[PDB]
Amino acid sequence: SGEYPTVNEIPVGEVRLYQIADGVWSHIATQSFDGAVYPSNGLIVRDGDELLLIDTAWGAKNTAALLAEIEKQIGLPVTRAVSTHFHDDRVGGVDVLRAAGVATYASPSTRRLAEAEGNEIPTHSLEGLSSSGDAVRFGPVELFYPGAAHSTDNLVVYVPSANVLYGGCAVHELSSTSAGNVADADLAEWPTSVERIQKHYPEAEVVIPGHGLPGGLDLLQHTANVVKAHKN
Numbered sequence: 001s002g003e004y005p006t007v008n009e010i011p012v013g014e015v016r017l018y019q020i021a022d023g024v025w026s027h028i029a030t031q032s033f034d035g036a037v038y039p040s041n042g043l044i045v046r047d048g049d050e051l052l053l054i055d056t057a058w059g060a061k062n063t064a065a066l067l068a069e070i071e072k073q074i075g076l077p078v079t080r081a082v083s084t085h086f087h088d089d090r091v092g093g094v095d096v097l098r099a100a101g102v103a104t105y106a107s108p109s110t111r112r113l114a115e116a117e118g119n120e121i122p123t124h125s126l127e128g129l130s131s132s133g134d135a136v137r138f139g140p141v142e143l144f145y146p147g148a149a150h151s152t153d154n155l156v157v158y159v160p161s162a163n164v165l166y167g168g169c170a171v172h173e174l175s176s177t178s179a180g181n182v183a184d185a186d187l188a189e190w191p192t193s194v195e196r197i198q199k200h201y202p203e204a205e206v207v208i209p210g211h212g213l214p215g216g217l218d219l220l221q222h223t224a225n226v227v228k229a230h231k232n
């Protein structure tokens with residue numbers, strides 16, 4: 001009824017949208033992994049009379065549900081999608097998207113890693129993002145490669161019309177007490193990658209983590225802090 005929806009409010013398989021700013025929504029879904037249930041976020045950005053999707057809803061049936069929810073609540077077609085790293089909470093559902101006519105994109109680094117993991121593989125490669133600090137435009141967003149953090153390939157997304165920073169899994173929510181799933185992370189480089197985000201997007205007004213509640217720029221420093229406590 002208005003507050004951001006949390007893991008225990010979303011049954012696995014359903015998707016909810018949350019209006020972030022004019023023409024910007026997050027999408028929230030939940031999924032089981034190794035016997036526990038987790039929420040995860042993605043983004044939807046209006047692109048004239050079309051929509052740009054950032055990240056799947058973590059699984060084929062969740063992603064089908066995402067498309068249905070977008071049709072019900074927004075009613076504009078999703079024409080393109082970008083996945084911000086290779087894990088299943090970002091690419092699982094790409095095959096559903098591709099069968100629904102969505103053009104799916106990721107960096108070559110994400111595509112390679114997805115293929116090697118046995119995860120679904122976006123169709124199109126995003127060049128111009130291979131060195132930390134790189135930025136490219138993609139529809140109504142800017143894609144930025146901050147360097148290795150949660151994963152070596154993680155991208156962040158900025159919506160300049162609204163000053164919305166979508167951190168993906170490189171950014172954690174304020175209530176987080178540890179650094180999430182770090183199996184593919186670079187804990188030593190993560191703070192430097194966060195500092196690059198902070199320097200490049202000093203006017204961000206909303207910061208959205210890969211999992212959990214949006215907030216403001218605090219999420220960036222908090223992320224660095226929880227990652228340092230983990231490496232320690």
Ligand SMILES: C[C@H](c1cnn(CCCN)c1)c1cccc2c(-c3ccc(CS(C)(=O)=O)c(F)c3)c(C(=O)O)[nH]c12
Nearest residue numbers: 033038087088089169172176177178179180181183211
């Ligand atoms: C799909 C993904 C994954 C990551 N790696 N692998 C290994 C490769 C295997 N094929 C799979 C995955 C599965 C389960 C949970 C998480 C969390 C996560 C966990 C806990 C928290 C709470 S917290 C910050 O307080 O610790 C959280 F927010 C997110 C994150 C994240 O961190 O992005 N990914 C997750």
Ligand SMILES: [Zn+2]
Nearest residue numbers: 085087150169
């Ligand atoms: Zn991940």
Ligand SMILES: [Zn+2]
Nearest residue numbers: 089169210211
């Ligand atoms: Zn994640």
